[PDB]
Amino acid sequence: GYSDRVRQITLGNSTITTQEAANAVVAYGEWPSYLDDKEANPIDAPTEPDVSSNRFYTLDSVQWKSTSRGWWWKLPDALKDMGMFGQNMYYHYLGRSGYTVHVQCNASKFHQGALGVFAIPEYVMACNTEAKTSYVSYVNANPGEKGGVFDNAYNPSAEASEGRKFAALDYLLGCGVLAGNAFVYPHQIINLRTNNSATLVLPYVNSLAIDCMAKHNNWGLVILPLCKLDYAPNSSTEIPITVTIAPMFTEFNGLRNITVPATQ
Amino acid sequence: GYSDRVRQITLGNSTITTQEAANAVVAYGEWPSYLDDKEANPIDAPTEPDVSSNRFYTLDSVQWKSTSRGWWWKLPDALKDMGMFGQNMYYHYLGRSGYTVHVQCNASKFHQGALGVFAIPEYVMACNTEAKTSYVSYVNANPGEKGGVFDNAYNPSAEASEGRKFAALDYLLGCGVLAGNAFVYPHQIINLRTNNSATLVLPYVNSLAIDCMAKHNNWGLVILPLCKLDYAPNSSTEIPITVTIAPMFTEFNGLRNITVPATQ
Amino acid sequence: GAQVSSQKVGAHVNYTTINYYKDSASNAASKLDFSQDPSKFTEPVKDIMIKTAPALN
Amino acid sequence: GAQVSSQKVGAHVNYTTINYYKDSASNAASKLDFSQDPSKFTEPVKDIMIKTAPALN
Amino acid sequence: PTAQSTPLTSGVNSQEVPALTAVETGASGQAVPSDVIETRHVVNYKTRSESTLESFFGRSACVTILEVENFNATTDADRKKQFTTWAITYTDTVQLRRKLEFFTYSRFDLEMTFVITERYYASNTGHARNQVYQLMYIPPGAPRPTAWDDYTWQSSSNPSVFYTYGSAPPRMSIPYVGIANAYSHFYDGFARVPLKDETVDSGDTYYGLVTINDFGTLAVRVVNEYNPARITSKIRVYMKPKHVRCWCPRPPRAVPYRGEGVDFKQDSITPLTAVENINTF
Amino acid sequence: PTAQSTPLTSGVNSQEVPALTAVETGASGQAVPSDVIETRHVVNYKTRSESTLESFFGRSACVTILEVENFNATTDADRKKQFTTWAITYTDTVQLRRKLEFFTYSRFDLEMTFVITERYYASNTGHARNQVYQLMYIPPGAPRPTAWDDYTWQSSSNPSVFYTYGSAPPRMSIPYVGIANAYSHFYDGFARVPLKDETVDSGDTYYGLVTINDFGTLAVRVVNEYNPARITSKIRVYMKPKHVRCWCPRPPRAVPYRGEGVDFKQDSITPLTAVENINTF
Ligand SMILES: [Ca+2]
Ligand SMILES: [Ca+2]
Ligand SMILES: [Ca+2]
Ligand SMILES: [Ca+2]
Ligand SMILES: [Ca+2]
Ligand SMILES: [Ca+2]
Ligand SMILES: [Ca+2]
Ligand SMILES: [Cl-]
Ligand SMILES: [Cl-]
Ligand SMILES: [Cl-]
Ligand SMILES: [Cl-]
Ligand SMILES: [Cl-]
Ligand SMILES: [Cl-]
Ligand SMILES: [Cl-]
Ligand SMILES: [Cl-]
């Protein structure tokens, strides 16, 4: 009766079902966990918000078209405005979190296409001016739940002030490496003939036990159309991709007044 | 290998197969049985016709259209003209029977629609004149294998003599209760995307051990389109619904000359 | 002849009953019967359905 | 079923009670409860205060 | 016995999927909160005591209002006002009937209670001595009265209760008296089989329980002879089912009754009030 | 258990100073006579029996007076006099209310008793037969009567008591029926949260217990039809809390009430009578 295709995930007051999954990935074979006393750093008693924040938050959906080049988000950035997770994040200097990432995209037995879904530690991307290096604004690096998109062209700016955004060039993974090698990162593929969802469970990954969430994104989430969407009755059709993410084993230190980042 | 979707039922010289079932219902959790000595009433040695009568009889099929409002039958009325069951029924004053009811309706993976299939004890229905109450003719109450149909309008007669039939108003289940609550009765649903048949096994149900079959129907069988039939290439398409019913554990008392009911 | 039974609890004991009449029809209400079996109406299926399993396999 | 209890004394014994009803709400008054703890209102202090000692030391 | 407690549970990530099912099977949804959310432990001390059948039906309900009078009657019509007869039923009123009709069959004993009230018809005809009432149960077959003072009221075998005005409401218990093994609240049938080519009328015959039910007759009179002052009385009849069993649940009555049957009335078959939109909180 | 006996004590000359304290701590004075005078031994056999909560509340108190009439009503206003409805509360009167309001929360069963009285409206319209009253408890949601003889009085499920004039005052017990774990005598809050920029009225909304309390309705009628003589009746309703627990004591009401809330009236907020001088024996 039980199947690699059928799964339920419950966190807090939220549950996901899927009937066309393809197993699930646990990044680097490691489930998230709380920070042990023998690896701890800040000494204040941490806040562990548990069910208030460790639950599924669904981002605005994006549309997959035959011309789409792909999508990216950063974490914890994408969830910074999400319920009590966002509040705990911004009221504290330090935070750590794992995640369950659930990417959703259904179609029909007559559609075709394949999405690569990658979780990338320290997903540093190229800037869009050749007058400077590493020249990206905080606002452009941290778009929040809207994330960003890839392009198949690189057109760096004429003036440095106008190029302070990512050059998210698809085939170079926005960072000077070939996209065909992205499979070295934890990943699944949503191949429409096979499955309608991808599930990745991510431990906290960093060179530190805990860090400043408002300064530093630990993971990138990349969705690339490896094989273009095609549907014979209407090649211009669009199907939604929906991203739902739950923080896990969240832990925060260094409580004070709330952080309100710059918006422009 | 074995599956909730695949079933064989054999009674007497008759067998049914289905490859898209959805389990089977045993009404009130009770399989039919013969009448025990400690619950018996008439004292003559009963006739128990066994395989001659306890076998599948297939009624005339009806057509499900996008405009159909539903169908009803009564039992044992629907089987009164069926082989040796009918003969045993009419040669005796008293009879009791359980049933296996098998409702059949296949379509395609591109059709949609849902039928509620309900077995209703003492299915008393409203009459169609407001000049009288409980004013239904024997002939109209007992249509036999043709059964009857529901309507979505109630138009009671101008004269009492013309309204001596059921007002089978669909949303009131022909009896002044809301159809959405019919699920309190033993039931299955034929939802075309899921299954192509319903199977209900019914014990004898009455306030007596045994009764006059020609006077009294113990069960109603109701088939209501809960979601209308739809098929995109032809919205006017029709698909058959076929009802096949086997008496079970039949027992008859009070043998005499044959009962021949009025026909007009 | 006296039956001593638990009372239904109030805001913050037992009670005594004696039947005075020769017909049981004369008796007061039947004692609380907490019997139930919703499954005969909510799950009257021939083959057992395990919740955690697929309903259709 | 009968409960025998001490009466409140008068000018110069026991009494008997039988409950007739199936609901405790029907019962007569609760028996005298002499429980008390005035200190929860008269001395709700965290640290014990000894009368003979200074209240503030 | 109590209603269900809730166990302490955390989350899941599993091939066990209690949230999904297939109601085509005829099974209702079965999942509970611990199947689909993280739950704390909550001990449930609450019980379903008041929804047992005995509790649900444990009330005396008014089932009819009868009228009788006491005065010097000089016409046939006025003589017929000196007593009344009523075929015993629960269909004169709607409340108890609807509750019983959650079920197809029942078995119970019955407590019957009566409330008797009077008023003066007029004030210029003196007064009236305190009245005694006779309520006689006439089982099917026993002779029914045609006058308030005929021989039937001697009631040698029929049960009668004599009630004195102003006394406590009278009351008696009745056993389960059905000739079947349970009462039928619904009967999908007829009292006889009409046969081929018979000359018996088939145009004015009835259908269902009305063709087979007969619980006898209640006959009521004022035992006193007339005073100069005409007194008019009402007798309210109350029924409480006790020692109750019921079988085969049904959807409850959704629209007004219009008689003893299941029939409905054309101007009263729209119970739902339409909502403004499917999205209306 | 008894109140405190007094021990034999003589004087002291000591660093133990039970006469001094510091009430800034939130503790009341604790010293007793043996701490500050020479005392004899006195055995105290007296008890605090009559100041237990059960004893303090162990009385039936009148909480309201209702009126109903029986006469031939030919106008809407007069038809409405044939029955009465009353939202069940203890705030129509002041005495029981003030006693309950020594506490913030309570839990108790209730004994309800009724005293029913009549008089003739006039003397030139003959007389009236003895009347039967129906007192029906209508829980929140159950249909309320719009006429003295409408269908609601059949009372299949609501509890009703039928009372015959001149009989002993009728009486019934009610369990603790609160939907919380105790009754609240005071509720510092509202029934809903008004939200930012909503269009719901905020100018005519209320505050406190009145926004959340609902103990249903008592409906009363005379069951009899009209006599030529109009009869007017009063029904006095009595409540006795029994099996009582209470929590969180409060200062008692010091000034007149002016309604169901804690509000006070400008002409009645000077409870103390001034003394001539601080030195007035
Ligand atoms: Ca045989
Ligand atoms: Ca399941
Ligand atoms: Ca001191
Ligand atoms: Ca429990
Ligand atoms: Ca759980
Ligand atoms: Ca003492
Ligand atoms: Ca001393
Ligand atoms: Cl955001
Ligand atoms: Cl800013
Ligand atoms: Cl036929
Ligand atoms: Cl004929
Ligand atoms: Cl006589
Ligand atoms: Cl007389
Ligand atoms: Cl009434
Ligand atoms: Cl009257």
C11 touches chain F (CB under 8 A): yes
Interface test with A, best of E6, E14, E17, E21 (most A CBs within 10 A): E17
Tell me if A8 and E37 make a contact (CB, 8 A cut-off).
Answer: no
E171 touches chain F (CB under 8 A): no
Neighbours of B46 (CB within 10 A): 21
Location of structure tokens 């067998």: B15
Ramachandran region of residue A72, left (φ > 0), alpha (ψ -120 to 50) or beta? beta
Helices first, then strands: H and E counts in chain C = 1, 2
C22 touches chain F (CB under 8 A): no
Ramachandran region of residue F201, left (φ > 0), alpha (ψ -120 to 50) or beta? beta
Check which CATH number belongs to the domain holding E164 and give it.
Answer: 2.60.120.20
**Residues in binding site of D for Ca(2+):** 51, 53
3-state secondary structure chain E: CCCCCECCECCEEECCCCCCCCHHHCCCCCCCHHHHCCECCECCCCCCHHHCHHHHHCCCEEEEEEEEEECCCCCHHHHHHHEEEEECCCCCCCHHHHHHCCEEEEEEEEEEEEEEEEEECCCCCCCCCCCEEEEEEECCCCCCCCCCCCHHHHCCCCCEEEEECCCCCCEEEECCCCCCCCEECCCCECCCCCECCCCCCCCCCCCCHHHCCCCCEEEEEECCCCCCCCEEEEEEEEEEEEEEEEEEECCCCCCCCCCCCCCCCCCCCCCCCCCCCCCCC
DSSP, res F228: S
F152 touches chain E (CB under 8 A): no
The tokens for A51 are 């069910």
D8 touches chain F (CB under 8 A): yes
CA distance to D43, D45, E261, F28, per residue, from F23 (Å): 10, 11, 79, 6
Distance from CA of D1 to the nearest CA of C (A): 6
C-alpha to C-alpha distance for C10 and D30, rounded to whole angstroms: 11
D43 touches chain F (CB under 8 A): yes
Angle at E129 between CA E172 and CA F123, to 5 degrees: 120
DSSP 3-state assignment of B155? coil
Tell me if B29 and C46 make a contact (CB, 8 A cut-off).
Answer: no
Q: With beta carbons under 8 A apart, name residues in chain C contacting E30.
A: 42-43, 49, 51
Q: Is residue F35 within 8 Å of residue F18, measured between CB atoms? A: yes
First to last CA, chain A: 54
Domain A1-264 in this protein, CATH class: mainly beta
Resolution (A): 1.4
Angle at F215 between CA F212 and CA F217, to 5 degrees: 125
Answer CATH for C1-57 from 3.10.20.30, 3.20.20.100, 3.40.50.300, 4.10.80.10: 4.10.80.10
Interface of C with B in 21-50 (CB under 8 A): 37, 39-41, 44-47, 49
C-alpha to C-alpha distance for F162 and F160, rounded to whole angstroms: 7
| Ligand 12 midpoint to CA E134 (Å) | 9
Q: Which helix (H) or strand (E) holds A223?
A: strand A219-230
Residue C22 among known ligand-binding residues: no
C56 touches chain E (CB under 8 A): yes
Q: Is residue F228 within 8 Å of residue F115, measured between CB atoms? A: no
D50 touches chain F (CB under 8 A): no
**Residues in binding site of F for Ca(2+):** 2-3, 5, 9-10, 20, 34, 37, 44, 222, 224
Task: Label residue A140 exposed, middle or buried (CB < 10 Å: 0-12, 13-18, 19+).
Answer: middle
Distance from CA of E49 to the nearest CA of C (A): 7
Ligand nearest the Cα atom of residue B52: 1
Closest residue by Cα to residue E158 from E226, E88, E217, E111: E217
Beta strands in chain C (DSSP E): 3-6, 14-17
Ligand nearest the Cα atom of residue B50: 1
C-alpha to C-alpha distance for D40 and D35, rounded to whole angstroms: 13
CA F38 to chain centre: 46
Helices first, then strands: H and E counts in chain D = 1, 2
CB pairs under 8 A between C and F: 19
- Rounded (10°) CA dihedral C17, C20, C22, C27: -50
Which partners does chain B have (≥3 C-beta pairs < 8 Å)?
C, E
C-alpha to C-alpha distance for E155 and B122, rounded to whole angstroms: 38
Domain range list for chain C: 1-57
Q: Is residue E234 within 8 Å of residue E116, measured between CB atoms? A: yes
Residue F210 backbone dihedrals phi, psi, to 5 degrees: -60, -25
DSSP 3-state assignment of B7? strand
Half-sphere exposure of E231 (CA within 13 A, CB side): 29
- Rounded (10°) CA dihedral C39, C45, C49, C54: -130
Tell me if B23 and E27 make a contact (CB, 8 A cut-off).
Answer: yes
| Pairing mode, strands B7-11 and B14-18 | antiparallel
Cβ-Cβ contacts under 8 Å for F56 (sequence gap 6 or more) = F50, F99
DSSP, res F57: H
Task: Label residue A12 exposed, middle or buried (CB < 10 Å: 0-12, 13-18, 19+).
Answer: buried
DSSP 3-state assignment of A212? coil
Q: Is residue B99 within 8 Å of residue B245, measured between CB atoms? A: yes
Cβ-Cβ contacts under 8 Å for C42 (sequence gap 6 or more) = E27, E28, E30
C-alpha to C-alpha distance for B115 and B188, rounded to whole angstroms: 8
Q: With beta carbons under 8 A apart, name residues in chain E contacting F129.
A: 117-120, 165, 231
Angle at F149 between CA F148 and CA F154, to 5 degrees: 110
Q: Which helix (H) or strand (E) holds B58?
A: strand B57-58
> Which approach determined this entry?
X-ray
C-alpha to C-alpha distance for F186 and B256, rounded to whole angstroms: 80
C-alpha to C-alpha distance for B201 and B99, rounded to whole angstroms: 6
Tell me if D25 and F176 make a contact (CB, 8 A cut-off).
Answer: yes
C-alpha to C-alpha distance for E260 and E206, rounded to whole angstroms: 12
Interface of E with B in 167-206 (CB under 8 A): 178, 180-198, 202-203, 205-206
C-alpha to C-alpha distance for B12 and B79, rounded to whole angstroms: 16
CB pairs under 8 A between B and E: 175
Protein residues with C-beta less than 5 angstroms from the ion ligand 1: B 48
Q: Which helix (H) or strand (E) holds B85?
A: helix B83-91
Closest residue by Cα to residue E167 from F114, F169, F231, F130: F130
E25 touches chain F (CB under 8 A): no
DSSP 3-state assignment of F268? coil
F120: containing domain = 1-281
Q: Is residue B129 within 8 Å of residue B160, measured between CB atoms? A: yes
C-alpha to C-alpha distance for E256 and F4, rounded to whole angstroms: 71
Location of structure tokens 């237990």: F52
Instruction: State which amino acid sits at residue E70.
Output: N
Ligand nearest the Cα atom of residue E231: 15
DSSP, res F212: T
DSSP, res D8: P
Q: With beta carbons under 8 A apart, name residues in chain C contacting B27.
A: 44
Q: With beta carbons under 8 A apart, name residues in chain B contacting C45.
A: 23-26
Q: Using CA of residue A128, residue A129, residue A135, residue A139, what is the dihedral sign?
A: negative
F157 touches chain E (CB under 8 A): yes
Q: With beta carbons under 8 A apart, name residues in chain C contacting D2.
A: 16
The string over E178-200, giving b where at least 16 C-beta atoms fall within 10 Å of a residue's C-beta and e elsewhere, is bebebbbbbbbbbbebbeeeeee
Q: With beta carbons under 8 A apart, name residues in chain D contacting C29.
A: 22
Q: Which of C12, C15, C16 sits opposite D30 (nearest CB)?
A: C12
DSSP A38-90: GG----SPPB--GGGTSS-EEPPPEEE-TT---EEEEETGGGTTSHHHHHHHH
Neighbours of A198 (CB within 10 A): 27
Instruction: State which amino acid sits at residue D41.
Output: F
Provide residues of A within 8 Å CB-CB of chain E.
Answer: 2-4, 6-15, 17, 19, 24, 51, 100, 199, 201
C-alpha to C-alpha distance for A197 and A20, rounded to whole angstroms: 7
The tokens for F108 are 């108790």
| Pairing mode, strands D14-17 and A239-255 | unpaired
Closest residue by Cα to residue B124 from B221, B224, B220: B220
| Ligand 6 midpoint to CA F246 (Å) | 26
Closest residue, chain E, to C26 (C-alpha): E173
Find the length of chain B. Answer: 264
Helix/strand/coil percentages in chain B, nearest 5: 15, 35, 50
- Rounded (10°) CA dihedral F78, F82, F87, F89: 110
E22 touches chain A (CB under 8 A): no
Ramachandran region of residue A208, left (φ > 0), alpha (ψ -120 to 50) or beta? beta
Interface of A with C in 4-33 (CB under 8 A): 6
Q: Which of A17, A51, A199 sits opposite E38 (nearest CB)?
A: A51
| Ligand 11 midpoint to CA B263 (Å) | 4
| Ligand 15 midpoint to CA E232 (Å) | 7
Task: Label residue A193 exposed, middle or buried (CB < 10 Å: 0-12, 13-18, 19+).
Answer: exposed
Closest residue by Cα to residue B190 from B220, B152, B229: B229
The tokens for E167 are 């006394």
Q: Which of C2, C12, C15 sits opposite D22 (nearest CB)?
A: C15
DSSP, res A258: P
Closest residue, chain C, to B184 (C-alpha): C41
Cβ-Cβ contacts under 8 Å for D46 (sequence gap 6 or more) = none
The tokens for B132 are 């009288």
Distance from CA of E32 to the nearest CA of F (A): 24
E8 touches chain A (CB under 8 A): no
Using only the alpha carbons of chain A, give its radius of gyration.
Answer: 19
Residue A154 backbone dihedrals phi, psi, to 5 degrees: -115, 115
C-alpha to C-alpha distance for E135 and E159, rounded to whole angstroms: 9
Neighbours of F197 (CB within 10 A): 4
C-alpha to C-alpha distance for F222 and F217, rounded to whole angstroms: 17
F25 touches chain E (CB under 8 A): no
Q: Using CA of residue B57, residue B62, residue B63, residue B68, what is the dihedral sign?
A: negative
Closest residue by Cα to residue B116 from B195, B61, B3, B57: B195
| Ligand 14 midpoint to CA F18 (Å) | 72
The tokens for B169 are 């108003």
Q: With beta carbons under 8 A apart, name residues in chain F contacting E168.
A: 164, 167
Q: Using CA of residue E266, residue E267, residue E269, residue E275, what is the dihedral sign?
A: positive
CA A96 to chain centre: 15
Ligand nearest the Cα atom of residue F45: 6
